[PDB]
Amino acid sequence: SRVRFTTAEVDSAVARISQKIGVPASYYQFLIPIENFVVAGGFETTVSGSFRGLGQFNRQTWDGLRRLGRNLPAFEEGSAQLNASLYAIGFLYLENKRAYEASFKGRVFTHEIAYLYHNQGAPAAEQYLTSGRLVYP
């Protein structure tokens, strides 16, 4: 119920995909080790149960991206796949960047904030920020 990926293949795919869709590679570099099992030379990612793949998506959020017109494989296929899982992380980043920039005009959508949105979901993350829960330097 896990898939193992190598550092080399993740780095290559992230470089290609980040370029294609305009999401910084450094965001992936932050998120992937946070969400997955870091092993010598790569990662293991859970592809069974409710939260799957490098992004640790649930089915409702994966399908939510597909509802937007993002071309992704089905949840159970794409989460076990390197490229699709990376596209999904990035597509979600892009939706969240738009949401954040509309809710919080004049502020930067940082990697930290992007991950807060990824992990909590946009409705909860917006409320977390509006309620003053993120500490800033």
Ligand X SMILES: CC(=O)N[C@@H]1[C@@H](O)[C@H](O[C@@H]2O[C@H](CO)[C@@H](O[C@@H]3O[C@H](CO)[C@@H](O[C@@H]4O[C@H](CO)[C@@H](O)[C@H](O)[C@H]4NC(C)=O)[C@H](O)[C@H]3NC(C)=O)[C@H](O)[C@H]2NC(C)=O)[C@@H](CO)O[C@H]1O
Ligand Y SMILES: NCCc1ccc(S(=O)(=O)F)cc1
Binding stretches for ligand Y (CB under 6 A): 104, 107, 113, 129, 132, 134
Token representation of residue 98: 């738009």
Q: Which range binds ligand X by CB under 6 A, 7-15, 16-24, 36-44, 62-70? A: 62-70
Select 19 or 130, whichever has its Cβ closest to ligand Y: 130
3-state secondary structure of 58: coil
Among 64, 97, 109, 111, binds ligand X (CB under 6 A): 64
| Distance in Å, CB of 9 to ligand X, minimum | 22
| Distance in Å, CB of 116 to ligand Y, minimum | 9
| Distance in Å, CB of 98 to ligand Y, minimum | 14
C-alpha–C-alpha distance, residues 101 and 23, integer Å: 15
| Distance in Å, CB of 65 to ligand Y, minimum | 23
3-state secondary structure of 103: helix
C-alpha–C-alpha distance, residues 68 and 44, integer Å: 29
Token representation of residue 135: 């500490």
C-alpha–C-alpha distance, residues 67 and 25, integer Å: 25
Q: Which range binds ligand X by CB under 6 A, 1-9, 19-27, 102-110, 122-130? A: 122-130
Strands 42-46 and 2-6: antiparallel
Q: Is 128 in the site for ligand X (CB under 6 A)?
A: no
